[PDB]
Symmetry: C2
Subunit: 687 residues, 2 copies
């Protein structure tokens, strides 16, 4: 190690969540929206430790065992140094925001700050609404918190003192059943909006919770929280001579998933100890003191007790007028006529859902093939496939059984189908189909005509609204056959398969990408117009990054738009002098990755679902589509223009991880995510 | 057969549901409440055919096979003659009520009566809300409605006409997902409240549902509904030499559960035929034409678009102040102090639920035994038993696995418990524990003290509110030990067991009842004061009835209050000259049966859960409790007084099944179910 050629993705990520914090600070966002961001920020860091950080640990360990060769503990340090520095910054904001909220007449107060009236109000409220959910868990020598104790929940450790006697009991903050923020009755000026945390209501009612059956001189409560690291598995597909030589002392010290125990700073050491034991806090397990509150994630639902101004105004999802043209009898005619490209959340997912409902009873529809990844809870699509089954249609449904977090939510999504006449097909052990396709075939007088759907993100009717994704609808055989192939590839991957238009992970990808970059590089070494323009969530894969460094050094211009991690360092004398990269963190979540290559003058524009990360190129099922229709190719190009024209949310990506905001020169003030809406909105104006 | 000594229970029942209809007619009830009654009436008759009537069939058949000896087909006739006569009466009311509703500015109109504006309104409404739930089921030669077709749902059979061509398709009225009554926008006077049936919206949009993929000159829709008879099993416990000799032609013709097919009168015979087949309508299956609408049961939720007046005013459930007395530290002290008797729905079930939540963490609570019959969906009691488990408490839970209709809802209520430390105990094949007890033991300084709960109805937190039930809470060992025994009896019934205070079905009952009646009879044949006063839901059991006839003829006075069936004929010269019986059908449902015997002068008062019906005395687990506390014994006596003092809802029971209303002589105007409230209300006034 000498002069960083790339940026550690884990550090790049910290910087990414920091950009998220900038949203909490950014005064241009409504007050309540900023509060909620704090929740996003927290929930992210939460997943950071549960997954990505736990992953890094292992790698650094896997390194050790027999041959660790990366300045790992120097990175670990940098990591927690950025985190601590952040935590103190988080603390600043929360304070600032608390003040600001008060200015707007809202007051998040604690049990000690109650009025000699609200007190009597709470007690009543508690006995009439909360009590039933709050039942002491007694800590006895045989009680084994180990099991029944809820993972990631907040608990209140109660200290029951009677003389030199001390009994211990737990109180679960029921954040699931009851709202975590309760509005107290306005003391004097009816203007004020006072609220208290559910945690502090309990803290305030400890006596009413225990006096009925316990004798004590005093009661003390301290909060604590316990979290387990995520599940491992995909790291042995390299441990050739490693996992083989790897000693049992390391397999046990690598498989065993640790436990993090967090407790309020002033919890009497005796109680901490009591828990250290009851919670099997062994060697590899972590014990950390700190704070009265945990689960700041719960701020993602901070209610809004002010005027609408304090909250973002919801944009109505738009109908793509094309589907409505009276010259179209139905959805299949609209698509047969022209390739249709929808962009969520500006458009309603309601079209794809209408289409699928049609195919389920349209006499001409012969079959339907479609995959169920991480869709919305209890899909309305499932019901449709059932109808199609009941109406004939050869219905084929692929269900992957292990996503990133929405895994066990597709192990039930099956026994049902089969019974009605559906051919169900499960993905291998832990394989992820991050693409979301569906193929529909229908006898259109004599001939069979296939209509496919290629969706960059997933069928989640919840994902369309917080995420921005594409949805291509086509009858173009060039693309149609390719989707058909994809589904075949899934059912029988043992059989050789090739794709001429789609980029399919992990069949081509690497090859298909290297090859496109290598061509721009070629045209650049010939002085022709070249260009690489990517819009990804993460740019990390070693190979792909170097491939870009190469493009830059060969004169090829590269414009990146990565909202998350970016191990690529832009502006490196002789390495990446022609690579400009920014990040836009706004309301919505980018779920759509694009690829745009100059390819001489005839630009190739791909809509993908994969980030330039190793796991997305070589280990999961991903799909990227070229836009054969120049009309649609253009639309995507405009949108990408609005994006790179942002001067409100865009930030620079530098080898300094500064997250500075792109300055608006004499150029216009643009906020992509909003301009994008007006762009779409203008497309749906009566022809 | 000559001079009916008893009344056929099936006829008595028809008369009972007729009393229910009288509620729909009774102008003293708010308009919307009367509408909803029509639904009750319908839902009842619905269950009448699914169960009781299907049961009678079998008996009459079981009679046949080798030896049928009851004027069965003479009864069948009487049965459907009362039903037809009723149906025509039902029709009258509905019409009258429809008129009355209009007077109040409400108009339930059909698709043909829409305005040339609401039409355009519906279509829009349909495409934006209903469409997604309405997907044509195409009827093809291979389609087998047989399976996937929903039982008891309403379907619209659509006729697609194109030349001399006719295609058939089904449309399911989605009463489960969408409200069955939609409010249309007021045409001219803003006063009017126009609404249409969901069935008729479809009927009106047939074109918008099919034009997209079908070519036709016309579309016709006709409603139909299919119902299956309930499940059989408890009739072979007598077929000694019967079931044995019984021929396979009868076991097959007796087990096989028929299917009832109902269709709109004018459905083209071709379509009826199409369905006769698709629906495997075999021999024993029933096919019946009639009406545009089915499922009148859906009227139990008829919305109220008028002023509160049109709906019954909800009485707030009262706290039993006794549990609140400051001299009581907790629930166990209130009960240890005095036997506590709660009467629902006047009181909140909230006490029993508070008590159970305490026992789950009260250090002195050692164990808890309790049964899970037909409780409310996802019990809050289950969670409590889990805590108790987690807190030590030897928790024992009995789960019967087959109730009358809430059966499979207790097959899941288990795997959960065991895991946490709960001793689960399942009831035999099809055994019903219609009692609802729980025993709690707690070390009260040295000694162990048991507190039991004896509930006449079930733990259903839904049942407490439409039903009127008792709930006795006591620490009296005389009763405590007896409950303890009950639970033991359940766990090990193979072991001999005896009860000295509780009436337990089917251990004593018969004996315990015969014996009490026989004693009054004795005191009556000695000129002493005797009396039998029952409050039941049904008085049918042969033996018990004759036992009463005997009491009457021996001079013993008998006062019956049966809301449902009553095979006993009151006022039979020389048979039942001293038996006065009435029925009160009001808002609430009687789920509390009492028993009261004069017993010399020292009256015995029992609170039971069993009706005087054979299945409740000899085949199910029932529990009746004597009221050892004279204070509580008195309260029940007052309530029973208010009841028999009713002169608003009380009806006479006669051998004419006239359902005449008890006339208010110069006596006061009383409405028990309301007076009962004021009685309780007065008991909870600050001491």
């Amino acid at each position: 190690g000498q002069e960083k050629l790339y940026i550690e993705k884990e550090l790049s990520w910290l910087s990414f969540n920091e950009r998220v914090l900038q949203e909490a600070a950014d005064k241009s966002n409504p007050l309540i929206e900023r509060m909620r961001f704090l929740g996003i920020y927290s929930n992210n860091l939460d997943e950071f430790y549960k997954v990505r950080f736990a992953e890094l640990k292992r790698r650094i360990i896997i390194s050790e065992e027999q041959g660790s060769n990366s300045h790992s503990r120097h990175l670990l340090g940098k990591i927690q140094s950025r985190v601590l520095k952040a935590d103190q910054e988080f603390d600043g904001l929360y304070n600032e925001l608390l003040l600001e909220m008060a200015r707007n007449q809202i007051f998040l107060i604690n049990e000690r700050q109650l009025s000699v009236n609200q007190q009597n109000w709470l007690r009543h409220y508690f006995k009439q609404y909360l009590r039933q959910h709050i039942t002491p868990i007694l800590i006895n020598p045989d009680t084994d918190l180990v099991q029944f104790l809820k993972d990631d929940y907040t608990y209140l450790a109660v200290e029951i003192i009677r003389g030199d006697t001390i009994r211990y009991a737990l109180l679960e903050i029921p954040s699931d059943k009851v709202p975590r923020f309760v509005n107290l009755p306005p003391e004097a000026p009816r203007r004020r909006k006072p609220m208290i945390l559910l945690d502090n209501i309990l803290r305030y009612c400890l006596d009413d919770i225990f006096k009925g059956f316990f004798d004590y001189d005093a009661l003390n409560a301290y909060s604590m929280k316990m979290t387990r690291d995520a599940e491992y598995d995909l790291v042995h597909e390299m441990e050739a001579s490693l996992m083989e030589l790897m000693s049992s002392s390391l397999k046990q010290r690598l498989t065993a998933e640790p436990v993090r125990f967090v407790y309020q700073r002033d919890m009497p050491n005796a109680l901490v100890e009591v828990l250290r034991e009851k919670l099997t806090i062994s060697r590899y397990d972590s014990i950390v003191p700190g704070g009265r509150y945990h689960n700041f994630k719960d701020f993602i639902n901070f209610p809004n007790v002010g005027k609408a101004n304090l909250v973002n105004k919801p944009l109505p999802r738009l109908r793509h007028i094309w589907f409505d043209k009276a010259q179209f009898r139905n959805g299949f005619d609209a698509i047969r006529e022209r390739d249709v490209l929808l962009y969520y959340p500006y458009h309603t997912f309601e079209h794809v859902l209408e289409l699928l409902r049609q195919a389920s009873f349209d006499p001409s529809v012969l079959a339907i093939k479609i995959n169920i990844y991480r869709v919305a809870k209890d899909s309305r699509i499932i019901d449709s496939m059932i109808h199609a089954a009941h109406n004939g249609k050869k219905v084929t449904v692929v269900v992957e059984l292990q996503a990133r977090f929405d895994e066990e939510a597709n192990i039930h999504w099956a026994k049902r189908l089969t019974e009605a006449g559906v051919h169900v097909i499960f993905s291998a052990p832990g394989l992820k189909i991050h693409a979301k396709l569906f193929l529909i075939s229908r006898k259109e007088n004599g001939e069979v005509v296939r209509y496919a759907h290629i969706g960059t993100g997933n069928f989640n009717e919840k994902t369309a609204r917080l995420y921005t994704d594409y949805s291509l609808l086509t009858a173009d055989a060039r693309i149609t056959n390719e989707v058909r192939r994809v589904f075949n590839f899934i059912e029988n991957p043992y059989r050789p398969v090739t794709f001429d238009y789609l980029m399919v992970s992990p069949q081509n990808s690497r090859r298909l990408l290297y090859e496109m970059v290598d061509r721009e590089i070629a045209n650049a070494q010939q002085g022709l117009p070249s260009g690489i323009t990517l819009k990804l969530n993460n740019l990390v894969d070693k190979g792909l990054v170097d491939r870009l460094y190469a493009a830059s050094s060969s004169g090829v211009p590269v414009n990146l738009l990565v909202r998350g991690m970016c191990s690529l360092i832009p502006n490196l004398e002789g390495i990446s002098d022609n690579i400009r990269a920014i990040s836009i963190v706004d309301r919505y979540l980018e779920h759509d990755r694009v690829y745009i290559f100059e390819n001489g003058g005839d630009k190739k524009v791909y809509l993908s679902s994969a980030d330039w990360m190793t796991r997305n190129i070589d280990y999961r099922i991903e799909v990227a589509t070229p836009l054969l229709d120049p009309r649609l190719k253009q639309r995507v190009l405009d949108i990408i223009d609005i994006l790179f024209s942002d001067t409100v949310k865009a930030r620079y990506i530098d080898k300094e991880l500064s997250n500075r905001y792109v300055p608006r020169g004499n150029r216009r003030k643009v906020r992509a995510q909003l301009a994008i809406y007006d762009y779409i909105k203008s497309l749906e104006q009566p022809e």
